[PDB]
Amino acid sequence: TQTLELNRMRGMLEDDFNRKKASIRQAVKEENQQLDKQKRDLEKQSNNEKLNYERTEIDMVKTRGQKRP
């Protein structure tokens, strides 16, 4: 009975340790998923901003007609 009381100790401790480590790994996976959104969004913002700026530049250039004094 004592050796069973102790083997269940070992078993419970190990089947808790492993679940804890797997939880840590899942948390790291979530952290990387989160980090991905930064490079997903900053690039979108910079793309839209380049679009706006270069469109405004095209406009300002094209807005040169004739003077006719």
Binding site: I58, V61, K62, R64
Partner: protein
């Protein structure tokens, strides 16, 4: 902080210098009264900024010129050293009789500028070479300041006369008389010529009626972009000497070429992007440099390129390596990695990327060649000689100057020959 003195001789040099000071003011946002809106400017009591420059000519008319255009109100009257006659296109006047009568005062005020300064790095000169005032008085000042300030380096943006653009007919004499004296007391004689500027402004930007204004604008742009990697931070900084070591392996092979990018017109700017591949594909061409010496007719002993804006050093350096491993025929082999870059984190007003390119090539000898050529067909007949022999000038000057021209061109020729 590595201050710079700014000499402007002759009418051409003075107009170009006015253009350059107004471009600089456009860069650091200094309205034409000298208020905000120390490498170039000096503080005057009241927070005013007076450009640390000095102007000179023998015809006070040019005075009024620099008082006409905007940003003319900046320069200080305590540096306006001027004559009365005007060198009248002759090199004798502005070097032996009348020039030497004003070199004293101009050197005095230059000493007043320099001795007050503590961190002085290098000089800079803007002057024609056929015009008597510019060529003569400027080369005399160069001789003086370089026998007095030996260590520091020089910069003479000499605007050489090209023959296809005819202005006067005494250009070769003054040209050679200047170039013989430039090769000793000046370490960086970066040449420009109105032929290349006319060609560029015609067939690169479709300008309708180009006048000297926009040409001086382009030269001022190049001159600013040269040292823009000094007054502003950058991921890989450079200065005058970092240029002046990677570009000149000898005490005589110190004659350069200039270039600037990018340039396009309204009806054409909707089609080109702005990345270092495109700027590189534009800057190394022939119609994108400001010297009438076809670069593909030789090689480059060396070349540096100062970028302005913010890019990823990898793209710049890979583009350099690629263009060096592609046009290897137009490059020289006995010096490895014969190109150099310098990234600077400040673009010009209104752009994102800009390139100022300098190149020591073995193809500009041709230029000097043709000038010396004219000399022959104007010296064997001894034409227009008495205007020189009347002011102590003797015949040894012309013959030894042509000798030195031949020596220089043979140097560049044998280095085009020199391989390994």
């Amino acid at each position: 902080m590595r201050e710079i003195v700014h000499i402007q001789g002759g009418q051409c040099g003075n107009q170009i210098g006015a253009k350059f000071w107004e471009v600089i003011s456009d860069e650091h946002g200094i309205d034409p009264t000298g208020t905000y809106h120390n490498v170039y400017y000096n503080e005057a009591t009241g927070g005013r900024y007076v450009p640390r420059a000095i102007l000179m000519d023998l015809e006070p008319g040019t005075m009024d010129s620099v008082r006409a255009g905007p940003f003319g109100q900046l320069f200080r009257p305590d540096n306006f050293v001027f004559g009365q006659t005007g060198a009248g296109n002759n090199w004798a006047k502005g070097h032996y009789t009348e020039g030497a009568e004003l070199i004293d005062s101009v050197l005095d005020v230059v000493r007043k500028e320099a001795e007050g300064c503590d961190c002085l790095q290098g000089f800079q000169i803007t002057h024609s070479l056929g015009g008597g005032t510019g060529s003569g008085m400027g080369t005399l000042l160069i001789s003086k300041v370089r026998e007095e300030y030996p260590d520091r380096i020089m910069e003479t943006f000499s605007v050489v006369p090209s023959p296809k653009v005819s202005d006067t007919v005494v250009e070769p004499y003054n040209a050679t008389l200047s170039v013989h004296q430039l090769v000793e007391n000046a370490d960086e004689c970066m040449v420009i010529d109105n032929e290349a500027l006319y060609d560029i402004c015609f067939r690169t930007l479709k300008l309708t009626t180009p006048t000297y204004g926009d040409l001086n604008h382009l030269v001022s742009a190049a001159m600013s972009g040269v040292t823009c990697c000094l007054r502003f931070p950058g991921q890989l900084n450079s200065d005058l000497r970092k240029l002046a070591v990677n570009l000149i392996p000898f005490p005589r092979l110190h004659f350069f070429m200039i270039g600037f990018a990018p340039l396009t017109s309204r009806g054409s700017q909707q089609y080109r992007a702005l990345t270092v591949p495109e700027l590189t594909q534009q800057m190394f061409d022939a119609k994108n440099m400001m010297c009438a010496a076809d670069p593909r007719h030789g090689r480059y002993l060396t070349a540096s390129a100062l970028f302005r804006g913010r890019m990823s050093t990898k793209e710049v350096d890979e583009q350099m390596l690629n263009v060096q491993n592609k046009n290897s025929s137009y490059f020289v082999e006995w010096i490895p990695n014969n190109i150099k870059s310098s990234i600077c984190d400040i673009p010009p007003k209104g752009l994102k990327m800009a390139v100022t390119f300098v190149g020591n090539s073995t193809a500009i000898q041709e230029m000097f060649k043709r000038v010396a050529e004219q000399f022959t067909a104007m010296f064997r007949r001894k034409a227009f000689l008495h205007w020189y022999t009347g002011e102590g000038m003797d015949e040894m000057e012309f013959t030894e100057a042509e000798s030195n021209m031949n020596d220089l061109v043979s140097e560049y020729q044998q280095y085009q020959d020199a391989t390994a």
